Amino acid sequence: APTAPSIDMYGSNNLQFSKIELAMETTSGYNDMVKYHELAKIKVKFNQWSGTSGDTYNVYFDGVKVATGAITGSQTTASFEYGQGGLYQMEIEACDATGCSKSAPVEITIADTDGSHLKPLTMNVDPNNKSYNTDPSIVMGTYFVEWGIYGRDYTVDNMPVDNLTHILYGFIPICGPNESVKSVGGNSFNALQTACRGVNDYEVVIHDPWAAYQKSFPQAGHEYSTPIKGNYAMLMALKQRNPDLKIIPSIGGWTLSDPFYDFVDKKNRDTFVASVKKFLKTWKFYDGVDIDWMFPGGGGAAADKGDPVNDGPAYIALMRELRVMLDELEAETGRTYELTSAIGVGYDKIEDVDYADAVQYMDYIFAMTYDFYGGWNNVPGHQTALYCGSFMRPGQCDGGGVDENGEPYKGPAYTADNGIQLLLAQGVPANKLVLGTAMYGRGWEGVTPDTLTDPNDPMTGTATGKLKGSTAQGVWEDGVIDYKGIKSFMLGANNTGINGFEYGYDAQAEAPWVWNRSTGELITFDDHRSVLAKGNYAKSLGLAGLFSWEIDADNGDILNAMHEGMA
Ligand SMILES: CC(=O)N[C@@H]1[C@@H](O)[C@H](O[C@@H]2O[C@H](CO)[C@@H](O[C@@H]3O[C@H](CO)[C@@H](O[C@@H]4O[C@H](CO)[C@@H](O[C@@H]5O[C@H](CO)[C@@H](O[C@@H]6O[C@H](CO)[C@@H](O)[C@H](O)[C@H]6NC(C)=O)[C@H](O)[C@H]5NC(C)=O)[C@H](O)[C@H]4NC(C)=O)[C@H](O)[C@H]3NC(C)=O)[C@H](O)[C@H]2NC(C)=O)[C@@H](CO)O[C@H]1O
Secondary structure (H helix, E strand, C coil), rough: CCCCCEEEEEEHHHHHHECCCCCCCCCCHHHEEECCCCCCCEEEEECCCCCCCCCCEEEEECCCCEEECCCCCEEEEEEEEEECCCEEEEEEEEEEECEEEEECCEEEEEEECCCCCCCCCCCCCCCCCCCCCCCCCEEEEEEEEEEHHCCCCCCHHHHCCHHHCCCEEEEEECCCCCHHHHHHCCCCHHHHHHHHHHCCCCCECCCCHHHHHHHHCHHHHHCCCCCCCCHHHHHHHHHHHHHCEEEEEEEEECCHHHHHHHHHHHHHHHHHHHHHHHHHHCCCCEEEEEEEEECCCCCCCCCCCCCCCHHHHHHHHHHHHHHHHHHHHHHHHCCEEEEEEEEEECHHHHHHHHHHHHCCCEEEEECCCCCCCCCCCCCCCCCCCCCCCEEEEECCCCCCCCCCCEEEECCCCHHHHHHHHHHHHHHHCCHEEEEEEEEEEEEEEECCCCHHCCCCHHCCCCEEECCCCHHCCCCCCCCEEEHHHHHHHCCCCCCCCCCCCEEEEEEECCCEEECCCCCCEECCCCCCHHHHHHHHHHHHCCCCCEECCCCCCCCCCCHHHHHHHHH
């Protein structure tokens, strides 16, 4: 019977260990900042200053032996490796020929990126978000944006998680050609160059490591010694609260799509696919991958890129190859991984891909049924309408008609139904299509009554420019405004219209607007009525469900209407 081991807390790093090393006080290349280990190196020191020390020690985690070795004096260091994250009751046992003596149990922490070491996240959700009993098989998705923690002041704990099945995290960049990033400003290109130092072209990185894993959030109990912080640690804690929730990294987006055009070369796809596998092993809270390429065939941020012959086949091959890779992860982990993509729904984007071929490898297509009209020009229209609006010309809807100059339309009008129908026409199953809802408006100014051909329809007018305003009103970029801003500053309590704005609805299109006759300010968006129509439409067609961009811009009204529409 030797003296029972006494744990040296200071010599054992306060029993805090981690499978991941993350730089917290510096910024450099991704591979320099992030180091993942399949096995955590555990080092525990114990003391036996009185009595006999014995010959042998045994280390137990919840009664199960994880280590053993020799005792050669009053003080002993137990060094071993362990690969499962979590919290364990550790006891250390000292043995000789006459018996064994155990230490009192103490908790050891082994951090991993599945959040297994973390307590479920405490939520701080706007109570305007209601509770629903929506069928869990129905997709209810949204995008959470990395940069939303700054000016937008929208954090992971703000998300109405119980009203979501899928959280898509925007955006993960790909190292390589990224000239489109420069349009963002705010030093975004430089930040990407820094992340990509020591990273091969066509491999993924984290754009903003401060937001991702460095920033200390007090609502998540982050402190100096916390091995993982930022959005990622909060998403890990969220997975602990909501284990059935799917959190998926979205690769690309409008400004980060440039590298995709080089996927015509399989070697570049190979590099990318391998990088994603590494990324999903490193960040275990993620449940698959979302590919947001805008767009195969061109028409995206980079005017000089797009290959209508080869992009579609590359996209299909990418999905096939990603699915093979995800199958490997499934075999290695016993988990189920999802493969998704957000796609343009303009006829001229859909036609460049055989989605029937692509979708056989995929769980969901997030149909981006918004941005049909906007401040990029001075032509008003419904940005996210289900159907063709009253403002449209004879035969414009189907595309068989003629425009103002007598020129034929080149394809069906930009509407949600036109896009969905085109996808179904390719042979895409309805139950893999997710319909897009807008949590923001697009807007113009100078659409004054004198510009209108139909005096009661501002969609028949002409603009002088983009909607302007302050970030207080949800205008983060000219021509774009948060739904919650529209509600607070244009709609008011009961859609009455405030501050010079009147409310209108196109029952043919299923699309709302607000219009200020004096300023000519006009905003197209989704509201309770239009979202109800989208939900009713989705269940009628047997679609997979609904998704939205972006949750920080909602006040609860849009996601509520999403659930009520699917009820
Ligand atoms: C039918 C048809 O074909 N119509 C065409 C139409 O499609 C075209 O318009 C484009 O449509 C597509 C959809 O098909 C849009 O792309 C998708 O939809 C959403 C919403 O539109 C996209 O969301 C944008 O995402 C970008 C990133 O890609 C966001 O950019 C961010 O901007 C903010 C500033 O607001 C930056 O914040 C700064 O961040 C730094 C830190 O980095 C911080 O320090 C600063 O404080 C902070 N500043 C501020 C002011 O907050 C941020 O860095 C940056 N992020 C990045 C990574 O670049 C942008 O805000 C989002 N816009 C809106 C609106 O929310 C999304 O990319 C994409 N979704 C998916 C799922 O992929 C596309 O946006 C749209 N383009 C345009 C130009 O509007 C049009 C025009 O070509 O043609 C029609 O024919």
